[PDB]
Amino acid sequence: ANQPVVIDNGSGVIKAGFAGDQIPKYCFPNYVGRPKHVRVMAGALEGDIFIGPKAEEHRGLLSIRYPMEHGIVKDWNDMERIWQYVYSKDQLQTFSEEHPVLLTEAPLNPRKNRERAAEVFFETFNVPALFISMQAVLSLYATGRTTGVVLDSGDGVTHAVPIYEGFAMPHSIMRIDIAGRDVSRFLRLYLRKEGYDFHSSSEFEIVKAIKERACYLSINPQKDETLETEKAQYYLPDGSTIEIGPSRFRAPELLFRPDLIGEESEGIHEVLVFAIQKSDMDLRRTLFSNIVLSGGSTLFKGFGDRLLSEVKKLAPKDVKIRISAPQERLYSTWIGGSILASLDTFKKMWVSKKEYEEDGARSIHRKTF
Amino acid sequence: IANQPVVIDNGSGVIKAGFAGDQIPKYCFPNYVGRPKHVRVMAGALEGDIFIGPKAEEHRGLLSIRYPMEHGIVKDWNDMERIWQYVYSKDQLQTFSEEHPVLLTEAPLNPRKNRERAAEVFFETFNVPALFISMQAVLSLYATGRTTGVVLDSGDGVTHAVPIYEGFAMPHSIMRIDIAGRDVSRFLRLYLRKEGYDFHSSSEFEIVKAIKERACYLSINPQKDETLETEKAQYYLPDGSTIEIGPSRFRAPELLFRPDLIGEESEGIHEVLVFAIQKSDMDLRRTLFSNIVLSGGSTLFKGFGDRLLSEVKKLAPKDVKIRISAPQERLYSTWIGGSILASLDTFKKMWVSKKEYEEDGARSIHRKTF
Amino acid sequence: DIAALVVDNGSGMCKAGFAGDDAPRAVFPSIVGRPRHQGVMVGMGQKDSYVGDEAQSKRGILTLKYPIEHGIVTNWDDMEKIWHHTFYNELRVAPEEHPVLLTEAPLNPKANREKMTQIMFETFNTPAMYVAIQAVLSLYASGRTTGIVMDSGDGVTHTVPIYEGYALPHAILRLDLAGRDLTDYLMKILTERGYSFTTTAEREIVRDIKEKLCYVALDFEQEMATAASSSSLEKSYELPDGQVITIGNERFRCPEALFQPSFLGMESCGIHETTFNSIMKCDVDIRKDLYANTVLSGGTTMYPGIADRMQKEITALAPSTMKIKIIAPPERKYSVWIGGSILASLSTFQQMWISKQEYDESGPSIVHRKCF
Amino acid sequence: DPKYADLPGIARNEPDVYETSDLP
Ligand SMILES: Nc1ncnc2c1ncn2[C@@H]1O[C@H](COP(=O)(O)OP(=O)(O)O)[C@@H](O)[C@H]1O
Ligand SMILES: Nc1ncnc2c1ncn2[C@@H]1O[C@H](COP(=O)(O)OP(=O)(O)O)[C@@H](O)[C@H]1O
Ligand SMILES: Nc1ncnc2c1ncn2[C@@H]1O[C@H](COP(=O)(O)OP(=O)(O)O)[C@@H](O)[C@H]1O
Ligand SMILES: [Mg+2]
Ligand SMILES: [Mg+2]
Ligand SMILES: [Mg+2]
C-alpha cells in the first residue's frame, strides 16, 4: 500500500525519491551549513541549520560541514538531521512511519557504520522495514544487465565490483578512498600553488565547481606535462577571473596516480583491472566486455579515453573491451534502487521492524551484503 | 512599560530626537553647546551661559561653540548630559524622561566605556525605565525596508561601511575611518584661507560648515574642472557681506575620496566601501554590490553619487552590477529606522530593564546588544 | 673561501648575514616608507623612499608598506629596494661576489620563487643562489633531523614534519594567521578599550605593545575570570610621546587568536590543531617520534607560556601513551636564519647551488627542479 | 513624498538610484 522510499546516500550529493519514479525527484548536496555570522536584524533567515537548496542559495553566509567522508558517516547527528530533512515538507513530504526505506551503502564499509545507520533508521524513524544495498547491484539493475563489472567513482569512494550473471564475488571487490572530493582537495592545493587561495569552507564549494567545469584528463601525462599549456580563464562567482593553467589537468590525474597525494594505493585503472583479475579466469573475458561506469567523478573530460588506454595497457593482448556507461551517471544508482524496490520479491528482502526488534544488528548483517 | 519609546539618534554634528510613532524626527538640532564668547560677570549680557538648539542659532555670532562628541566619541560628558537633558525640555518632546523607554544610536567599533557611561547617565540621572543602544548601520536597512545591503553611513564625525546579508552582520568586514563632514569642513576652512578668507573663530566654524552645505560639489574629473575657469559662485554671509568661494568649492569634498592630498593617512570613502565589500565572503560579494545603501549627511554632497559610482566601478570587478541606493531621506534614515525598530513588539524583548541594569550591572548593556 | 650570504626575507622582519656566523649581522623590519605630503615644498636632506630602520625612526611622517604579505611578495619594486638596502647599505658587500641563500615559506606561489630567482640573477648578478624552506632550516638550527617544525612568523604559520632528514610534502599545513593578524586584532581590542590606533605608523606601536606585554594564557577562561575579578594582570605601557596606557585582559586575548582563529573570523584550526593534524597525516610508525620532537620557530612563537599551552593542547588531542615535548629554544626567533647559515657552511652544499650558468641555460623555472 | 516636505535637509532634484547599465 505504501510505496517504499529510495535514498541513495551519496557522500557528495544524496538522492531521495519514491520507488517507481523515473528519476530522483529530490537531489541535494550532502552537507549541513550553519550561519557563522551574527544575527542582528529581525526578520533574518530563521534556523541555525541550513540543508538543501536553502544552503546553496545562501552558501556564502554559511560554514559547511560534511557528515559523510569516504563512504563512512563521521558526524552522526548531522546525518540524522539530513535524513530528517529528506522527510521534511520541502522535499518528499511523507511520514517516515509508513514507508519502507532502501538505503545505499558503499561496499566494504565498516560494520559499525551500517549498524548505526540501521539503528537511526529504526529508532529515530520508526520505519516498517529497511534494506541496505551496494551501489553496483543497483547500477546493474538500472542498466538492465545482470552481468558486468561496476566501477563507481563517487565523491568519497571509488570501487570496482564484478558481478557475473547476478552472482557477486565478495573477495574480488576492490575499493579505494581516492575519489572526487580528494580531486577537489588536490585542486585546491594546486590552485594555492598557482596563487589563488580558497581556505574558506564556502570557497571549497567554488573549487568543486571549478573541478566540475574546467578540468580534464590528458590522454598521456608526461607529454602534456612537458608541453606548455594555454592558461584558460575561469570566472569566479563574484566576477573576478582566475588563470588556471596546468592545474586544469594535473588535478584529476590523482585518480590514476594516488601517489601524487602521498597515498600508497592502487589507481582507478588498477582498481578496475585487479577487480577483474582477482575473479576466476573463465569469467574475465565476459567481465572485460561488460564494464559499467557510474558516479559523478567519471564525468571528467577524457576520462573514457584515458581509462580505455590504461586498461588496454594492463589487460591481456587482444581482448575485447567496451566501457559502457548510462547517459545520466549521477542518477543511475537511484534509478536502480527504484527498479529494485518496485519488485514484489523486494518484500522478501526486507528487514522488518519485528525482525530488528528481535534479532537486532545481527539481522541487518544477515540480510545485507 | 507600554508608553511610546523615545528614539534619539546621537549624531556627532546633528542629533535627531522624536517618538517612535512618528514617521520623521520631529525634533533635531546641532550637537554642540554654545557659551558666551566673553567671560561674563556683569549683568545685561547673554544670561544662562548654556545655549543649545535654535537659541544658539539666534545669537550665533556672540557664542563660542563646543561640540561634546568628536569622531563618534563623547568627550565632554557634562556637555552631553546637558544635551540629553535639553532633549527632555519644554522645547523638545515636552515630557518627563522617567516615562518612556529610550533607544540610543552609537557608531560602530566605539570604546566600551563610552557606551557604559552613556547607559549609566541614562539610567542614573534620568530615571528611564529601559534603554537600548543600536548601530546606525543596522537601522539604515530598517528604514529602507530591505533585509540585505551594504550601509555606507558617512555622518558628521565618522564614516563607516557595514555589510549585512539577510540580517546577518559581518563584524570583521566593518570598515571605519574618521574622515567625515567635520574634517571636510576643516579642509574647507584651510582652502578658504588659501582663497584669502579667515574663519578663525569657533563660531565661524559654523558658517564655513554652512558654506560646505550650500555650495560644494564633487567633480567626476577634478583635473578638468581645475583647468576649466571656475564660475566663482557668490555666497551671502549672515552679516550681509558676499564671498566668492572659487575652486575650493570642489577641492574640500575631494579629500573624502582622496584624503592623502592633505597628508591624512586614511582609506577614503570609496576605499572603505569597496574593502568592506571585498572582505566579506566571495559568494555574497555580487549581491553586496547590488545593494549599496547610502546614509548620513556627507552622502548628500552634490554629485557624490556619480563620483562614488565611478570609483566603485573602477575598483569593482568588471561587468558587475552596482546599485548605490541613495534615498532622498538619507539624512534622517537612521532615526526612521530606529523608529521602525522601536515600533516592533520584538523591541520589548531587546531593551534592558532598570532592575536588570541594577542587578547585572554594566555588562548587561554589553551582552544584550548581541 | 668566499662566504655565501644568507638573507632570510621574513614577511615582517628581514635578517641577513654571512654563512658560518652565530647570529645575523643585520636585522631590520621589512618595510618601505614613503613621504605622505605631496603638494608642499620638501626639505633639504631627504630620500624618495626610506627602507628598514630609517623608515622606522621616521615613521611619524612616512607611510609604510610591507613588500611581503602572507609570505607572498606583492610589490617587487619595494622588495628590490629592500634587497638593495640589505646588500649595499647594511651588509656592505657586493652581491656579485657571494652566493645568497634565500628563504621562502612552504606552499607559496611558484611565480614567487621564479621572480625571486630572476631578480637575484638579473638585477643583482649574483654568481649563484638557493631557496630553502624555512621549517627545514629551523630544524637544522635545533640540531635535529627528526621532528615537526611549527614555524610561525609575521605573515604565515606553517607546520612541516620531517623524519630522519626526509621531508613529507603531503603533510605540510600552512595557515595565513600569524603576526600581522594578531597585531590587527590587538588594534581592534585596543579600540574597544579606548585607545584608537589607525595609521600605519601606529601599527609599529601596537606591534611593540604586542612584543612587550602580551602572553599566552595556559587556561583562557580562568585568566579571563581573573582579569574580570581583579586588576593583577593589568600592565602599563609608555607610548613614544609619553602617554601611559593600561592593558588588561587584552594581554592574553591577542595571542589567544593563535589557538582560536574564530576570534579573527577565520574558520581555521588553531596552531595546536594544525600541528596535531599535520602529525596525524604522517605514517603511523613515525608519529611517536614527531610527538617527541615538536619544534617551535619564528618570531611569533616568543610569547611567554606558548610552549606550555601547546604542550597541554597537544597532550589533550594526542593519545595518552605518547610523550609530548614542545622544544622552544630561547633564540628561536633567529632559528630560521641560523640553520640557513649552517646550510651555507656545509661542504656538501656547494653542489646544491643554482649557478648562473644553469640559470642562463634553463631560465628561472630551474628553481622548481633544484630547490624543492 | 510630502511627509518629508517639512524637513530641512531633504535633498531633492536628484535621482534616488545610481547604478551601472544593465547587461543581459
Ligand atoms: N562534469 C563533471 N566533471 C567533473 N566532476 C564531476 C562532474 N559532475 C559531477 N562531478 C563530481 O561528482 C561528484 C558527485 O558524485 P556522486 O555520484 O554524487 O557520488 P555518490 O555516488 O556518493 O552520490 C561531485 O563531487 C562532483 O565533483
Ligand atoms: N547638503 C549637504 N551638503 C554637504 N554636507 C551636508 C549636507 N547636509 C548635511 N551635511 C553634513 O552632514 C553632517 C551631519 O551628519 P549626521 O547625519 O548628523 O551624522 P551622524 O550619523 O553623526 O548623525 C553635518 O555636519 C553637515 O556638515
Ligand atoms: N619577544 C616577542 N614576543 C612576542 N612576539 C614577538 C616577539 N618577538 C617578535 N615577535 C613577533 O614576531 C613577528 C616577527 O616574526 P619573524 O620571526 O620576523 O617572522 P618572519 O621571519 O617571517 O618575518 C613580529 O610581528 C612580532 O610581533
Ligand atoms: Mg554513490
Ligand atoms: Mg546618524
Ligand atoms: Mg620567520
Cα A121 to its chain centre, rounded Å, is: 20
H or E element in which residue A288 lies:
helix A281-288
Buried (b) or exposed (e) across C130-148, using 16+ Cβ within 10 A? bbbbbbbbbbbbbeeebbb
**Quick check: C198 and B263 CB within 8 A?**
no
CB atoms within 10 A of CB A43: 11
Q: Indicate if ligand 1 lies below 6 Å from the C-beta of A208.
A: yes
Instruction: Give the residue whose CA is nearest to atom 24 of ligand 2.
Output: B156
Ligand 5 mean position to B74 CA, how many Å? 14
Is there an atom of ligand 3 within 6 Å of C10 CB? yes
Q: Which of C326, C319, C346 is nearest to C152 (CA)?
A: C326
Q: What angle do CA B243, B249, B250 make, to 5 degrees?
A: 165
Rounded distance between C-alpha atoms, residue B367 and residue B360, angstroms: 10
Question: Which technique was the structure solved with, according to the deposited record?
Answer: cryo-EM
Which residue reads 633564540 in cell numbers? Answer: C331
Return the percent helix, strand and coil in chain A, to nearest 5.
40, 20, 40
Contact criterion met (CB < 8 Å) for B282 and A41: no
Nearest-CA residue for ligand 3 atom 21 is C10
Dihedral, CA of residue A41, residue A43, residue A44 and residue A50, to nearest 10? 150
Ligand 2 in reach of B18 Cβ (< 6 A)? no
Q: Answer whether B16 contacts ligand 2 (Cβ < 6 A).
A: no
Question: Which amino acid is it at B314?
Answer: K
Dihedral sign, CA of A183, A188, A193, A195? positive
Q: What is the 3-state secondary structure (H, E, C) of chain C?
A: CCCCEEEEECCCEEEEEECCCCCCCEEEECCEEEECCCCCCCCCCCCCCEECHHHHHCCCCEEEECCEECCEECCHHHHHHHHHHHHHHHHCCCHHHCCEEEEECCCCCHHHHHHHHHHHHHHCCCCEEEEEEHHHHHHHHCCCCCEEEEEECCCCEEEEEEECCEECHHHCEEECCCCHHHHHHHHHHHHHHCCCCCCHHHHHHHHHHHHHHCCCCCCHHHHHHHHHHCCCCCEEEECCCCCEEEECHHHCCCCHHHHCHHHHCCCCCCHHHHHHHHHHHCCHHHHHHHHHCEEEECHHHHCCCHHHHHHHHHHHHCCCCCCCCEECCCCHHHHHHHHHHHHHHCCHHHHCCEEHHHHHHHCHHHHHHHCC
How many contacts, defined by CB atoms under 8 Å, are there between B and C?
31
3-state secondary structure of A356: helix
Instruction: Output the CA torsion C194→C196→C202→C208 (10° steps).
Output: 20
For the CA of C207, the closest atom of ligand 3 is 27
Q: Do A194 and C110 touch (CB under 8 A)?
A: yes
Inter-chain touch D4–B321, beta carbons under 8 Å: no
Which chain C residues touch B71 with a CB distance below 8 Å?
Answer: 196
Widest Cα–Cα separation across chain A:
71
d(C-alpha B167, C-alpha A35), whole Å:
11
- Partnered with residue C148 across adjacent β-strands are C161, C294
Chain A residues with CB-CB distance to C72 below 8 A: 195
CATH code of domain A180-259: 3.90.640.10
Quote the Cα angle for A54-A59-A65, to 5°.
95
CA angle, residues A340, A344, A345, in degrees to nearest 5: 75
Distance in Å, CA B9 to ligand 4 centroid:
58
**Of the candidates C29, C121, C105, C35, the residue with the CA atom closest to the CA atom of residue C73:** C105
| A296 touches ligand 1 (CB under 6 Å) | yes
Judging contacts by C-beta atoms under 8 Å, the chain D residues touching residue B330 are 11
Taking residue C77's Cβ as centre, other Cβ atoms within 10 Å add up to 10
A100, A198, A239, B188, B324 from B192: Cα distances, Å? 83, 50, 43, 6, 31
Classify strands A129-133 and A101-104 as parallel, antiparallel or unpaired.
Answer: parallel
Residues in chain D closer than 8 A to B331 (CB atoms): 7, 9-11
Q: Is B229 on the interface with A (CB under 8 A)?
A: no
What are the counts of helices (DSSP H) followed by strands (DSSP E) for chain B?
Answer: 15, 18
Q: Which ligand is nearest to the CA of B104?
A: 5
B213 lines ligand 2 (CB under 6 A): yes
Query: By the CB < 8 Å criterion, does C370 face chain B?
Result: no
Interatomic CA distance for residues A338 and A18, integer angstroms: 7
Strand order in the sheet with C50-51: C50-51, C32-35, C62-65
Strand partners, A39: B168
B368 phi-psi bin (left φ>0, alpha ψ -120 to 50, beta other): alpha
Say how many Å lie between the CA of residue A12 and the centre of ligand 4: 8
CA C77, CA A163: separation in Å to the nearest integer? 65
Our CA-based measurement puts residue D12 at a distance from the nearest CA of chain B, in whole angstroms, of 6
Residue type, C19: A
Q: What is the CA radius of gyration of chain D?
A: 14
Strand partners, A50: A33
Q: Do C176 and A262 touch (CB under 8 A)?
A: no
DSSP category for residue D20: P
CA distance B185 to C270: 47
Q: Which residue is closest to B265 within chain C, CA to CA?
A: C199
- Give dist(CA B176, CA C188) in Å, integer: 11
A61: closest CA among C274, B76, B281, C2? B281
Nearest alpha carbon, ligand 1 atom 25 = A155
Phi-psi sector, C48: left (phi>0), alpha (psi -120 to 50), beta: alpha
Please give the span between the terminal C-alpha atoms of chain D, in angstroms, as a whole number. 33
* Ligand 3: centre distance to CA C333 (Å): 7
What does the DSSP assignment read for A12-72? Answer: SEEEEEETT-SS-SEEEES-EEEE-SEE-STT----S-B-THHHHHTTTTEEEE-SEETTE
> Residue B190 carries which DSSP code?
H
Check if the beta carbon of residue B275 is closer than 8 Å to that of residue B136.
Answer: no
- For residues C314 and B172, give the distance between their C-alpha atoms in angstroms, rounded to a whole number: 29
User: Which helix (H) or strand (E) covers residue A5, if one does?
Assistant: strand A5-8
Which 3 state secondary structure label does DSSP give B86? helix
Resolution (A): 3.4
Q: At what angle do helices A281-288 and A268-278 cross, to 10 degrees?
A: 140
Phi (first) and psi of residue A326, to 5 degrees: -65, 155
Topology annotation, domain B181-262 = Actin; Chain A, domain 4 (3.90.640)
CB C12 near ligand 3, within 6 Å: yes
Chain B residue with minimum CA distance to A63:
B281
Give the CA count within 13 Å in the CB-facing half-sphere of B117.
14
CB proximity C363 to A under 8 Å: no
Report the nearest atom of ligand 3 relative to the CA of C30: 23
Classified as helix, coil or strand, A354 is helix
- From the number of C-beta atoms within 10 Å of its C-beta (0-12, 13-18, 19+), residue A206 rates as buried
Cell numbers at B14, concatenated: 546633528
Interface residues on B facing D, Cβ-Cβ cutoff 8 A: 23-25, 297, 300, 305-306, 308-309, 313, 319-332
HEC string of B223-289? HHHHHCCCCCCEEECCCCCEEECCCHHHHCCHHHHCHHHHCCCCCCHHHHHHHHHHHCCHHHHHHHH
Calpha distance A319→A326 (Å, rounded): 23
Closest CA–CA distance from residue B282 to any residue of chain C (Å)? 14
Which residues are in the CB-under-5-Å shell of ion ligand 5? B 11, 136, 155, 334
Query: Could you give the 3-state DSSP secondary structure of residue B160?
Result: strand
B198-234 CB burial, b ≥16 within 10 A, e <16:
ebeebbbbbbbbebbeebbebbeebeebeeeeeeeee
A226 interfaces chain C, CB cutoff of 8 Å? no
Name the residue with cell 544524496: A14
What cell was used for A329? 551517471
Contact between chains at D14 and B305 (C-beta distance less than 8 A): yes
What SS3 state is found at A266? coil
